[PDB]
Design a protein around this ligand. Sequence first.
Ligand SMILES: OC[C@H]1O[C@H](O[C@H]2[C@H](O)[C@@H](O)[C@@H](O)O[C@@H]2CO)[C@H](O)[C@@H](O)[C@@H]1O
Ligand SMILES: [Mg+2]
Lengths: 539, 255
Amino acid sequence: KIEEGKLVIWINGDKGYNGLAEVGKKFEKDTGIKVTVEHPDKLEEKFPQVAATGDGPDIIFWAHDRFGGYAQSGLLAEITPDKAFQDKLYPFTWDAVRYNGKLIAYPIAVEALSLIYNKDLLPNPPKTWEEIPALDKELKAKGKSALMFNLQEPYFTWPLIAADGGYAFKYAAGKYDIKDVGVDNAGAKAGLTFLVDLIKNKHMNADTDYSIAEAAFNKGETAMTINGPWAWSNIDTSKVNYGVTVLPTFKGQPSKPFVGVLSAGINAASPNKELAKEFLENYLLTDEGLEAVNKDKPLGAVALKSYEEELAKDPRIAATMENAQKGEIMPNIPQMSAFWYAVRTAVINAASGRQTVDAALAAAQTNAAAMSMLPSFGFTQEQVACVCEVLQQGGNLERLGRFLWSLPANESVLKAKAVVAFHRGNFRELYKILESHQFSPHNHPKLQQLWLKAHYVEAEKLRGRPLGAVGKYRVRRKFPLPRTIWDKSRGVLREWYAHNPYPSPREKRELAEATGLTTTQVSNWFKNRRQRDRAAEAK
Amino acid sequence: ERVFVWDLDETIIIFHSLLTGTFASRYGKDTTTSVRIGLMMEEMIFNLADTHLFFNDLEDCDQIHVDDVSSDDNGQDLSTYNFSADGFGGVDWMRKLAFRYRRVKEMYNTYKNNVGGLIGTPKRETWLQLRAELEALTDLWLTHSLKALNLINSRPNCVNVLVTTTQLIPALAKVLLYGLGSVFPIENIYSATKTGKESCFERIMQRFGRKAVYVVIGDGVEEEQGAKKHNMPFWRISCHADLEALRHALELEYL
Ligand SMILES: OC[C@H]1O[C@H](O[C@H]2[C@H](O)[C@@H](O)[C@@H](O)O[C@@H]2CO)[C@H](O)[C@@H](O)[C@@H]1O
Ligand SMILES: [Mg+2]
């Protein structure tokens, strides 16, 4: 349960959580209410999982697009700002957090991706995507590359996919039509094809993620990157002579980033709803509150009019709003989760060469539409377990992933999540799953293989060359099977141990006789077996 | 690829629980109406079995599966064979046993979609009326199980098999009278009466191979233990709601 008389706040790890904790300290001094800020992984998915049980943070921060889903799940308290307070934030930011006429969160700041460029390498940045292959050639001559940006999160690739006509859900008659998905049209294909060709023609690598892109730009290895305002303070530290500017056009049309409004919701299960309101309205959403967070990691174009008047003078903020204006404010509807799931899969598959652009996007269209239309019918745990086992045995791992996604608010599920994580190459999440729960002996062999295969994949990539027998031997030694998935004479011993885990000296002699072992061996086996059973209880 | 291993009574059909009173109590229905429907269906089952499926002959020598009888059966046409006059473990005896099961197979195939034709008028009319009262009493149980079976039937790499504790011959009569003849080929029906379900599950796995996925569906502990033993996923039908949930999973292709 959430502790009454305290505030727990969750915000993403790329945001200014240290600055937010500073606002918390001032709040605590005034009120006696300690504030704790956390930035857990996969926050957007963890919140509904833990808030559901009445647990989790008092206050949740994410872009507004996740919030309709949260509200529909009954996870959010309605927020009650008065006219005076509402007047202090821009109307379009309130719009982003309005859901069926109700305000379901406080808007904090407008986030839009921009082109970030090295002015030393590139005083005149490219106006078009089309001119980027040629520019990369020119820079490769000098030991540099033209562009690196996160290719793992579809947030970063969507501006290009949307440029020539891709869209999530069609807006018509005052609402988003969840039956009209636009991920499969000519425009979307053209955009993703251009991206994939960049990769085919060696201008980008399909494995580039956030960290790799950030490191390269901040070290002056690449002339350009694509990122949001939160990224700017690390670039400041790097002393790179950077500019922030309009995204390149594609086929003569602007890149269209999906624009986020960082928002703060109150957990409906929180016993501290009035303290949360006081924190958000009277400490955070003030010139001094936002400045403290902004100084840590820039927020973007803040919702608070008084402070935005000052930030808007910054060319980096000017460029942010220009990109935002050419892009589109994300919908906040519950179906946005299905959209992002489907598109994430497609970009990864197309970029890696696993599927053609056409096939990847065709499947994304079908999946997004189908997932957005799923009935709310709930299955029992036993039924969920049965489905999980059937889909695994059938090798239907894509279906299994979508089924797991559908689960609302057991061992079979955890095993399924591990298999899917492995399937996706999410090895960190896989290891977390394998290590965090005790599994049944009959599930050990399969789970052991996942642990081993993943570690081999990771090792072989670090090696740049095929892992041979000795290499695999070394990996095994360096990363032993965790005890969560790893332990004829044994037969006699196990049956006996179930009756009595503490044999007497005479009973040990009888057992040594029956198993062909020595009493010393019998003793050791029993001690070990008791230690292991104990380790397994602790889980 | 996907083999669905069904139980019959209180899974696909409501029958035995009409006779015992447990359906009426568990579903809040009139006990009198319930037992009357059950008794009438029981009579139709035995009547069909005796009149058309040689049940008087076969009662104490029934089989696990229609193709089980080893004999010198030459495949001769039996359309003019006089079963009443043939004097039915020797060679002759086994051949006459085999003849009956081959004939039972022919009848099943001929009448699976024409049960009304098999039993004739006026039994047909009584049967249809009884089937309508059954649906009303059971809130469309059979209607729902048929939907699940037909959904599975319509899918490329899926198969329905039936494992029942009812003896083969009366099980065939039940299957016919409950409209299940077109969903289940007679070769997909196994009677566990003498042998237990475990043994039947093993025949099924031997038949469809070690690559198939076997999904076991039933209300009973026997099929559940059989499933566990062979690592076959199990979907319990403990009540009507579990059947509706099964239908939802099938529709979404979770199964
Ligand atoms: O990649 C899909 C992802 O995009 C957005 O997430 C952004 C987030 O809004 C930004 O604040 C920043 O932290 O980067 C994230 C991408 O890594 C959507 O908000 C999110 O729901 C969606 O899954
Ligand atoms: Mg049963």
